[PDB]
Each structure stands twice: as structure tokens, then as C-alpha cells.
Symmetry: D2
Subunit: 219 residues, 4 copies
């Protein structure tokens, strides 16, 4: 039936959770080109601001429908609608900090609706995250592979620090399409290039966030 | 004294495991200083659970720990302010749990508020296939770091085939008392034994625990401790 | 200066994996600036291997990486001093590898000395049951830390049933060149593709690799 | 006999940690059934160590463990065949150790052969800066898996600033006895306490350990 993902679509996000005991909430509105793999989002901290932790760790928590797929690789996420999908992720930082995320992605007309829950634990008191000594993400590469009827992903991310060092993390994600399994055109092993740029940061409250993404094979 | 010989438990828990939302409510009682407690947990939403309940049991109570050898009770002494804690539990087969908990004191009742998110539990693993049979007793190591109490522990989940499914826990305990008033313990161990006494209708569970905070006693050292 | 368009490889490796001792010797060649190489490996002791050879392949060569976009070659520029590296590889099923490697240059030959210890590979896992079918291409992130070059990567071992067995690699690369003379690169990626050309009688293997150092393109 | 009340220890250890080659030899004695032992360790090569000796300490003895509660001693009952074990130790700051060990019996002497590879210890971390002050006592969990004995433990390294540096150990113990003659124990705990009694000139170390195998008491 009708194709539900358009050249131009918008984003509505609500995210709440707890990082090292600190409760917070934020809302996001954005837009992008799903098939060109580009998107931009404006995030407003609505509760718990100003954040006592670096916003940068929220960034990869704030969008798998906006990925350009090349080489005929099936789009597990775009093809999931109208049902949509959820995903679960644990991100383990090398200094002990850890993030676990549950996300819900649904489609409402021209708007992707994102619902995000986040719990963070054991971020070191004098680490770059809790001290806010971070300076954005390096581009990262995710490996995507099928397992037991759903799509799994793992990636390494490198958080830039204001002392010059990188703070790395390991991500494990399971993506769950709500589509009938037999109706799933599951992709094969492939890569996902993600580049996140925080265009603006204001008053520890307002953040403009840009991402370009591509699903591809090696070279 | 704010903590007495016999006290009661009121718990609310909400979370999502591998995409499945659930809520549960607990009521129980125990002897804080004898390090024993029992709680009745009802799954109020998302029941019957599509996963093994056993992984919720250690999410469902640090005030009921018997402290020996003069080890300060970071949890009992935190009141009336109380405390929070945060924890990530990594299972050897890829599954993971992250928990936030709030512990406060209302008269004779300890109030527990728990939020849980679980990810990447293997579809055919013991947890999602409900092939578990309770926990082995666990030893947590407790040590101070940056003004608060940290804890790490290995947990061994018994499987129905006779095997064990192990996991690694990292927890930060955060007392709400002013740092000036905190009486921080030194490095020590926490023995925890969990027993699920009842399961009824995949919706009602009875859970008992005993716990002791101690130093290493089996292999002694020339200067304490 | 010391690295030319065509060079050879002489490798010696010994180690123990899940209690099984082994030794092997390798001889190969490649084009350092085109980022390609091939090598013939013979299990000289402990053969036939009771484990999948596939896990040894990423242990058997950083001088054969094509560097684009002006990225300084930490490994090629390390000579004549050369370099060492240390790596731990953790498999998702509990198996783990730790490797020490020594790389030196004698005339036209790169000299590789490799030590490996493997622990806790599951008895019925793909590695010990030899149910593996080579590696997916992998991406390593390279970044400077405390005067030397660090590397992390995820690797995915293909299994005969179709599934993947993933692992996490953490590596520190140590140039023997004086710190003041080291031309440290910035954060970048490393694409590695490993193909096992031949695998005979659990003792004789041919191994090909193409590698590229690049930014996010 | 084969394990008597008073036996001796002969150890040889070799390895590399962050690229630094080292060798050390050990001589000691203890009471296997009282779970106590002492040992003198000499750094024979690579001295003085550029890293803290403390991380070598738990690499340097499963025979000297007092078994209470009727726990079968997997290690004592492994002789004359003896046993090996394999271990990976992951520190919270990125450093890692992987060890292969061989334990055999020669008359009144336990013979230990140890291979160690260490990777990615932070340049300014406690280990490489030698800011450690001995180990806290540890608890290992022991459980059977696929015909052999597995172990996991948390170890906490005391640091000079008061903090602790924790690590996670995964070990597989492999008895050389025939599977059919193996008396495998059930899930139990292992209490280990290590004390370094002397440590002259970064080349000589005296090391004491008491150990007990038990249930939860
Ligand atoms: Cl920030
Ligand atoms: Cl159940
Ligand atoms: Cl093979």
C-alpha cells in the first residue's frame, strides 16, 4: 500500500531519564531528508536544567529513519512502517560510565514520533562527562547484522575532550521492527556511518543537533 | 532511632526489558539489623512477564543488611535524608540491565522507587526462555570513591540445565546526607542470598533475602583487616 | 626512505589457546603503499590446530596500510627503529586473546615476532568447534593517547550456520622512534579486509589482506 | 602420596607488559591443606620493572587452598597428571592481563610455568606509575562448565591516594585427569588474601598468600 516515508519529514521527540541520580527531561523538534540521510533537530531542556552532565551523551540518544541506504541494502527502519520500531541500547564508556536506552519510533502523518527513556550510571565524578569537558563526537561506524529475527548493531564512539584526549565507548543495540517477521526484508551484514555535529549550545538549555548517516558495505 | 528492629517495605517498580513494558508493586517487612527481609511482589502491568522474574529480584534493598565488625552502615545512617543508587548489570551472554533506585523513609516504612531498562537479552537465552532457577549467593565488594560508596559484584544465575549464567554488577550508592555528616566505611564485603519462595500465576512472587556486611574472615591478616 | 614499493614478510608466532600450545612460521610479500599483502603460514608445532585458524589471522601487519588524505603513517615512519604493539580481543561468548607483537626491518624484509595467549573459548563455541567461515571487513579507530597511537575495533567472525561472532579489540601501537621525531596522526579510521585463501590439513594457510587509513568519507 | 602437608614451590615466569619484556623465578614453600604459602620472587630479566609488581602477584598457585565443607579439591586431586589454567584480567581503566599457567608435580615440589601478556595499561595510571599498595582480599566464584572448572573474581588494587583500582578475572582451570576420574566440585567460593612482605630494589619480592575454598557462611 501507500508509501509512508517522504522526501521531507519532521521529528517530534520526548526524552526523560536519570544520569548519576539527576532527573531530566527534554523535547525536540526537527526535520530532515530520510533518503538523503540528513537531519537537524532543536532540543530544549524542559526539566532538570541546566544539566549537571555534558549534553554530548544525550546526542546519540536523540534516529534511524534518516539513513541513506546505498548498494541495495534494505532499509529495516523505513520499511517498518506504519508499525514502526523500537530499539534498546547499552553504551559502556571506558572510564566506568554506562548508558542504557529504550526508544520508541512511531509515525504520525508527516512526523516521526520519538519516545526515549535513559538511565545513566557510574559516570566518574571528575570525568569529562560530569565535569562537562567534552567537545563533540568523532564520526562513528556501526556494524549492522541480523540475529534471531531482528537487527543488531554494535559501534565504537569517540567523545572528544577539552584536554585533547578521546573518551571511547562501546555500544550494543538491538533494533526491533514491529513488522511481521515473514514480511521483513532483513538486510545482510553492513556498515553505518554516523556523523553528529552539535551546531549550537545555549545556556545549557538549547541545543541544535545535526546528523548525516549512510548505510553501506566496505568501500 | 529512625531505623527500628522491625520495619516495612513499600516498593513501586517500572521498566522495559527487551522492549516489553512492565510495572510491579511490592509490600513486605524485615529486620534491618538482623539483615533479613521478605517481600510480596505483584506484577501490575505487562504480566505475564515474557522474561524470567529472577532478573528483577536483585532490583527489588540495602537497609536490611547486618553490619558486623564495626563497619559503618552507609544506608541506615543516611536517614532521614535517605539515598539513591544506580547500577549496570552486564550478563556474559550480552544481556544488560541498568537500574535507578530511590530509597526514602516514611515513619515505619522504607519507600522504594525503581526504574529498570534491560537490553539485548538473547532471544533463546535462559532469561527470555525462562530457564533460570534462582540465584547463587553473591559477594559484593564495597569501597569509597569520590565522596560516595561504590559496589561491584559477580552474580551467578542458576539455569535449568545445571549451568550458570554469570553477570557483572557495577553500582554507585549515593547518600543524601551532607558530606560533612557522612560516616564512610572502608573496603568490605556484602554477602547477599536471594530466595524466591513462591511463584504464583506468573504474577505474584514472594522474595526473601538475607544480607551481611563484613570483612574477609576465612583468610585472616596480621593487621586488621 | 626505508620502505619501498615491494617488500617481504617473515613472521614467527608462538602461543597457547585454551591450553593448547602451538608455533607457526610465515613468509609473504606485499605492496606497503598500495595497502595489500599476502602470506603463507605453516603450523610448525601443535598441528593440527584444535581451534579455528581464523582467530590467528588478525594476529599475523601495520606496514601494509594505504594512507590517504594526508594521514601520517605512524608505522612506516617508525623505521629503522620499528614498533611494537599490544592487543586484547574480547569475544562476546567469553573467549579472549592477548597479543604482543614486535615489528622490525632488515633490508627488504619486515620481521614479525608474535606472542599469543587465548583463554576461556567456550567448548562448543564456533572457534573450538571450527565452525567459522572467515572475517567480515572491519573498521579500526586510531587515535593518539599519551604519546603513542591507540586502536579500537569491532570484528565479526562469520559462522557456518550464518550467524556472526563479534569481538572487541583494544590495541596500543608503540613506535620506537624518539617522541620528538614522531609525526603523530589525528583521529582516523582503518579499513581492514582479511581473506583466507587456502586452509589445508589444519597446518597450511594462505592469507590475504587489504588495508586503508582514511577519514570518514 | 601425592600431596603432603609440607611441599615446596618452583616457579618460572616470562612475559611482556606494555611491551616491556621481563623474566622472574620463584622459590617457596607452604602447607597445601592449611591453605598457606610463602614465596621469594627474583626479577631475573627486565629489572627494574617499569610497572607495579602487584599485578604479577596473583599470577605467581591453586594447590595451597584449604578446602572446608567437603569441597572436592579439583587441584590437589589432579595429580600426578596435574593441571593448567588460563586467565584474562580486565582492569577498569583499560589495562588487561592474560596468563597461561602450567602446574606439575615433581616429588615434593610443585612446578609452575607462567606466561603473561599485558596490554593497554594507561601511561599515567597506578600500575605504570607504581602508585599501588597491595591487594585487598578477593572472592572467586568457582563453578563447573563443559567438563572443567571455571572461575571469576573481582580484585581491588589499593592505590597510594586512597582509591581502589578494580579488575575482573575470568579463569578456566583444566585438570589433566581423565574426565571419567574427575571429581568435579559444585558452585563454591574461594577466599584469597595476598600480602607482599618485602620488596627490595624492585628486584626481590617476598609474597604470602592464604586461601580457603568454602560455601557461603
Ligand atoms: Cl555541556
Ligand atoms: Cl518466572
Ligand atoms: Cl580451521
Amino acid at each position: 500500500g501507500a508509501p509512508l516515508v517522504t522526501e521531507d519529514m519532521c521529528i517530534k521527540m520526548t526524552m526523560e531519564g536519570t544520569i548519576n541520580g539527576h532527573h531530566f527531561k527534554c523535547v525536540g523538534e526537527g526535520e530532515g531528508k530520510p533518503f538523503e540521510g540528513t537531519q537537524v533537530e532543536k532540543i530544549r531542556i524542559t526539566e532538570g536544567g541546566p544539566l549537571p552532565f555534558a549534553y554530548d551523551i544525550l546526542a546519540p540518544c536523540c534516529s534511524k529513519t534518516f539513513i541513506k541506504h546505498v548498494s541495495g541494502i534494505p532499509d529495516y527502519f523505513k520499511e517498518s512502517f506504519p508499525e514502526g520500531f523500537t530499539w534498546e541500547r547499552t553504551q559502556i564508556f571506558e572510564d566506568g560510565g554506562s548508558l542504557t536506552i529504550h526508544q520508541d519510533t512511531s509515525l504520525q502523518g508527516n512526523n516521526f514520533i520519538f519516545k526515549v527513556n535513559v538511565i545513566g550510571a557510574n559516570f566518574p565524578a571528575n570525568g569529562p562527562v560530569m565535569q562537562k569537558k567534552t567537545a563533540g563526537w568523532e564520526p562513528s561506524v556501526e556494524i549492522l547484522y541480523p540475529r534471531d529475527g531482528v537487527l543488531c548493531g554494535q559501534a565504537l564512539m569517540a567523545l572528544k575532550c577539552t584536554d585533547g584526549d578521546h573518551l571511547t565507548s562501546h555500544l550494543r543495540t538491538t533494533y526491533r521492527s514491529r513488522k511481521p517477521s515473514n514480511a521483513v526484508n532483513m538486510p545482510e551484514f553492513h556498515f553505518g556511518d554516523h556523523r553528529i555535529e552539535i551546531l549550537k549550545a545555549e545556556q545549557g538549555k538549547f541545543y541544535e543537533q545535526y546528523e548525516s548517516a549512510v548505510a553501506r558495505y566496505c568501500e
